[PDB]
Design a protein around this nucleic acid. Sequence first.
DNA 1: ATCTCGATAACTCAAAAAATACGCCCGGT
DNA 2: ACCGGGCGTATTTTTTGAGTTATCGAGAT
Lengths: 164, 630, 627, 372
Amino acid sequence: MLAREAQNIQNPALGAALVWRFCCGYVKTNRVSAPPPLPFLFLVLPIILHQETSEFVKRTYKSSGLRAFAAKFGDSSVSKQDLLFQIHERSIRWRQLSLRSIELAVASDLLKLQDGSDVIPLSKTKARGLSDEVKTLMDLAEKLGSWFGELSIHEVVTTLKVKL
Amino acid sequence: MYFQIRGIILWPRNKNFKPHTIRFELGKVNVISGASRTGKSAVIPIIDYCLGANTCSIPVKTIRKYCEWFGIVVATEQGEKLLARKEPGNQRSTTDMFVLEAENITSIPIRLEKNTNVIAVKRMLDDLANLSNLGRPAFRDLAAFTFQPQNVVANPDVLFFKTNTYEHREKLRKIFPYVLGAITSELMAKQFELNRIRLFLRRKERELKDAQDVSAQWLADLKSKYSEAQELGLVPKPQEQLSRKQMISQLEEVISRTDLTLKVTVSTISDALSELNTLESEERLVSRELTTMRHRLEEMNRLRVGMHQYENALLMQRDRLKISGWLLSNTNDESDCPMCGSHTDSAKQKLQALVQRLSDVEAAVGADAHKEVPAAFDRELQRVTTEVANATERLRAIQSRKRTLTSRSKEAREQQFSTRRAERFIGNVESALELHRKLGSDSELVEEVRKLKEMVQTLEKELREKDVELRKNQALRVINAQAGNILQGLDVEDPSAPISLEINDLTIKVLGDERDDYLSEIGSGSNWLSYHLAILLSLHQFYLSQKNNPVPSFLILDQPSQVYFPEDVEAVRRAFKAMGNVVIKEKGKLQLIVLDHAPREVWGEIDGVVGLPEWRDGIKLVPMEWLTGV
Amino acid sequence: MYFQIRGIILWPRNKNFKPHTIRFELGKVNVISGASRTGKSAVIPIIDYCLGANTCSIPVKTIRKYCEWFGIVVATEQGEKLLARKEPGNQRSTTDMFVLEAENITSIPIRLEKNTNVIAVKRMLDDLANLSNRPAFRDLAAFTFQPQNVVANPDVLFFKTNTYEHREKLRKIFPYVLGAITSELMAKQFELNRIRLFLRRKERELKDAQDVSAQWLADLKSKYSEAQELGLVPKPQEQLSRKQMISQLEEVISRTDLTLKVTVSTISDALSELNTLESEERLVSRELTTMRHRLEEMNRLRVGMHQYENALLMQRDRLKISGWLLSNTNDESDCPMCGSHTDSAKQKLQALVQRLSDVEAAVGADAHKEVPAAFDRELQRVTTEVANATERLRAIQSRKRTLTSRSKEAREQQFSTRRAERFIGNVESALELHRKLGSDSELVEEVRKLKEMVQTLEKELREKDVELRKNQALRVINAQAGNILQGLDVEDPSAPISLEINDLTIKVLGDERDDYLSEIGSGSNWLSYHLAILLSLHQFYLSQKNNPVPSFLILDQPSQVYFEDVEAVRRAFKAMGNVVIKEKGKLQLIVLDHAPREVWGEIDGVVGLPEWRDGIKLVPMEWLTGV
Amino acid sequence: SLQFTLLTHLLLQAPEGSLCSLEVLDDVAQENNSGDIKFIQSASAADRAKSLWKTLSNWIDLATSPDFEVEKAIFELYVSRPVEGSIVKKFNEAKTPEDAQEAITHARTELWGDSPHFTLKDGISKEISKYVEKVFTADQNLLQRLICNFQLTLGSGSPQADLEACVRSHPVSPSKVSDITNYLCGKVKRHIDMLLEAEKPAVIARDDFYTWYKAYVQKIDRQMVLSSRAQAPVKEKAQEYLPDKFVQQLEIIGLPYEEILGAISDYLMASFDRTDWAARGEVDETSFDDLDTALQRTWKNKQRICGLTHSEKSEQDQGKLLYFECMQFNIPLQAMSPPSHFIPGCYHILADSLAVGWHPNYTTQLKNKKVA
DNA sequence: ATCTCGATAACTCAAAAAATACGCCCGGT
DNA sequence: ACCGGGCGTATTTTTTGAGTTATCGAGAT
């Protein structure tokens, strides 16, 4: 009843759109164009739907790489390594929202789940006339997907202090 | 920490030859023999440059003319990392770098592109070493305990690399205590916390003491104050000596009276006094009316902001939900569950619920498309504003009448003066009693100061269980003991001289039975080299004996044989044998990169020492194929 | 200040033997020949020990057991001084020595006894050199002795600078011996730095005490706003300082005709301030919530630190989506995603969880190796900001509570003058505390007088000019050092030399890049550089008068780097003779060397003798009864 | 029910600080400064009518009392038809004392008779004959004054539409104009009833009706400001806006209007606060559920305590006590530090769902107001 | 050494405009 | 009312001038 506002601001539909754009940006940079593994989809909303972490995702150039994004957290002028460490914990806490995001992104022919526990993005032409906020969030998810794609699983999990 | 150099890599400037690799081994004395001609070893410049050295020390005329990306492979706790730095071109340095990571680096890119920058990799190395703390020892500052250029290894005076100036010397001097394990980052944090709490408690003690002083000095006048009160006619005649508690009781029950009247008879009431009382009653009425009216104006003013914020919240919810409509337009009536193969509408029903919520929010947004509520709100605000204006005008008129009455008459003037005195006294009592209650036996201030005192005492005690000097002394005891044990097997003029590492001097001190003397004065290449090796090996053995230590687990010994070789070879073997034992003494957690000229038979069959016909130095680490004369 | 060696004397240990006499030439280049590595460096130790020393640095195995007493003969402005000294034997230092003051004496005592102590000898030497009894004569020995360990050594440039204390004292003494400042100005600078430290500390404490805790500042602000709302005090244009507000409130109290000018304007302004406070409370509450959350998460990670093992390593639960997925599965709905139960669904869900576990196993354990706590800087800043923001939020909240609760039933009579007087009573009771709090005049004046004495010391010292003199001195030093280097067969005379004080060394000039002496080898260049710079320094010293440094220099075996063989040493020795002669026979040079007699005899204006043997050879053979 | 429309319309157009009278000499009156009240009448005009002359010659003397109209008294006539006889035409054109006197002479000739005999008095029926005799027996100067400035009114032809038009002309919410005029006219009618049930000359003072208008406008505006703002009101309940469930609970408790405004502001601000925290990612779909369950538990405990303690007070008083206790209550939750209004807003949101209540029978009382 | 400041060049973003394909409007069935 | 055609228009796409930034050099500590 109190939760209503949050359940509208962190609805699974937006999560599905974000995850779909993340996967779309991932295969767009992978060397072999392989689909990203499923346990990386749980690190999109905890990074994109958090405004300061998302701010760092936004401020880093698309060509600066995941490392340069994760290295901005500890900069003496910022000093927010705690957040780089909270990405994993926030992902732990937002498991249900991410899972419903994959739900709505698979059912809506946005992500086909390859039986090896992988996700291939389809085309499914873009949504119709969203607001600037949501379009920017989707673009950030695409950028983050590209970044995750450039690197291997081990490099990404190390750079984000994650434990799959 | 565990941090060893598995191999070096180079990328030719001309993209026609594959990158050249020089693979060391982990946990063994990696001997790089040969290189009769000695321009200078580039292994140390390459390793420091790839590790974030400020300026490029790589030979300009011989290597920078053919290498594009220098690189090393380092085995760490996180796993193998390939660290590469672009050749600085025509600059003292370039921040461009490439980094790769893996549990075991096997492949090597043929070409490299910028992947990170020097600052980021420096921070990565630091937090490998746990040196991202509150100004603090940095990774590069540890170059002292892992480098020994050809001069430093046998130089009787300089015992540590990067001790050639004031700033560097004092630097290393200030970092030694941290390395030895005395100053822990936890202790620095506790010290900073204690300082801040000291400042906070100082201010809080100042304020509490001032407030208690005010309370005490006022309470001293309590009896005179109560005499003044009974004089003013606010309390009955005190028949007998009173108690502070019941005196205060009288005072606050007096001040709490909603309408307190002076002790004056009404039978003989003048026209002026009756007029004064009537005006005062009108004043009370108007004041209450204006109080309620101000209440209403406050609530309206904040309700405007409330409506605006609710409008913004609804807009945000609509924005975050809108995509549900489109994501519904593309969802089939049912779908197959990704992870359980069930052809169910759960996704469809949830999209329907979200669309329902979007419909609700859309209805809320457009509930008053005709802006009637804003107009009604504005009209009501104008009503309240003009009503307050009228009330204030009425109050001003009342006060003007009252002042004219008091000015004209004199008995009314005296009455107003007396009631003003009474009210002023009551207000003074109110403020004083409020402060006295603020300084109660359990009030916020007393408890806060008490708990801050306890916190400061506890932090002081915590710092005092762990003494810096005792830790440093114990560390130096073990270091000197192990160094002497290493030295006795090694060849020195007398193998039974206890030694002491003077940190401030940054030098060994041989405590001989004849003279406790520095290494600087004993003139012999063999003894200088022996002491360097003994002290450094003991240092690193101690480091690896500790935990959460920030120094790399590797040591570069550049030309540990220049002292000989203007036979003596036997002595060299001793040295190397000792090194081997040291490396094998801790299950190969320590790696030694030994740039040397000692032929292979000196160390041919001594455990822990490895050497290959490859592993050249100077210019053969740059393949001649790349060499064309530039 | 003129101070040269005229001769040496060596009392034998036994009585029958008589002292060995030694007589130098003043103002000339005294030369000593012999066999090096045979203890041929004992004369600098003997001179140092005779002139006092914290320890005896004379070889005990070759020399220091055949001589009861040591002696030195030094010509000086006051006159000829004969100093003695007793070897300790088993001990290391001795305070027993005999002194003799004279102008030019010829009597040579053969038996001595203690006549002076170390302190007296040192202080008489000091006031002979006119130092602050702070520099001392021993601190000048760095410019007199150049032993073998220092003669050709790219890293040590002066004698006995291999200790933190010694090199620091010599560092702080260059400013004086360089002839750019006086001892009085040295003491002025020292006391000035002390008062700078004291002033900075006390000004920091003053700024600490001056700032008021947020609670009382809020109380004063609320009381002032209350008075303003009543029309007493006019609306300020900007945030008033605590003192201004107290002053205006006190003025309001002192009045007698309290004309409450309550209008729409005052009430509206009070309400606007209320809404502004509400906005600021919202903002501060949001930011404080963020910071607090960060802090508790940091605390959780640090707790995991101790939870996981004996040492410090933080633990955070794994994603374990493979396991978490089945955690939500039960006997009612197999799929934790769609929420259904079915055997085929259950088995394929299982298969999916094993696939996920396989994927996680790729980088599973690798992410559990040494995850430390690097966020201590962040933790400290966040805790500081949490405390500060909590204080500020409580202040704003109390202020707003006052402004609101002053609209419900507290004002129900407040706008009545009968109650405005009560309010003024409250405020003029509180003004006492609000004057006590955060008001200090003793510490501000203490800081003011500290600053004034600092200004006086600045004016007296006249800083920013001493370093100009030092720059000129070092420029002259470099000029004449290059001049000397021209006379020395250096492999690159075209490269100048700079005496870099801040490191106690020389920074070799270079066009490719700035270079030091330790960077490159060529010990011949090392010795050439030391010779050039040391003679440059002595020339500059004697260029001025009353210079504390003596006017004699000792080089020990400045030819060991040559162990064609004669041309280089000949060049160096003729350059030394040139500098000495052009100095007008006031500078004395004592060069112990292994070079043959003729090698140094070829120089015009340099004198010596193939006598003067150092090491065990200096002891007459008749004294030598054995090892 | 037509005179009500006419009087309402003309009072809306009447000047400020005016006074008007009903069914005394004409169906409409207005007061300015002196005797000879100015009057306006409605005709179903007719030159002759027993009621017209009856009222005129009956309470012109009462109209002669001072403080009621300038002696050159204005006069008007609203007629629902363009019919007007020659004598009445001449009356309306009488804007001068001489013209009014000539018109009265014509009236005497046609109704009373020719001077001096005045024989037409018998020519008209006794009923109206005596009343015209009374009219013409009074001083002819008074006859001049009573018809000195006679006028006639002819609106758009639809009195209703004109009434709603003039009402909507004033600054008012157009969505409620109809109801406004309705209420207004109703009041007049009810007023008239009580003035004639007691058998007293019914008077509708322009200022009394104007204050009624102001009071009702403010009433509807305060009703509107306490709109729904949470869900779309149903069109059946849209005619008069029905405040949300929590506002209804407060009103059942009987809190002051300003306290209700504060409650609404807290509700909106808390909604925005939760929305913003979610949009920042600080909170989520489960960070609040602990808060709501704790709020409900503490409310239940407080309700039990209040029922055990304040049973002596009336139900509304107990509800006020529980309300203020809950809103004053503040428990520090997880390290989120909320502003002052957050917890009151959360209680209000819960109250909107009837899961948390103030009135000890707030469910029953809410059903009552639903059927009220 | 780390850190900062400033200069630089390249980058991306953001606004405006044009082209676009969609939705709305008009005519016929 | 439903299907199909033709015109209108909001959105996407393209474009573009302005603005923002990662990087580098030099400096300072």
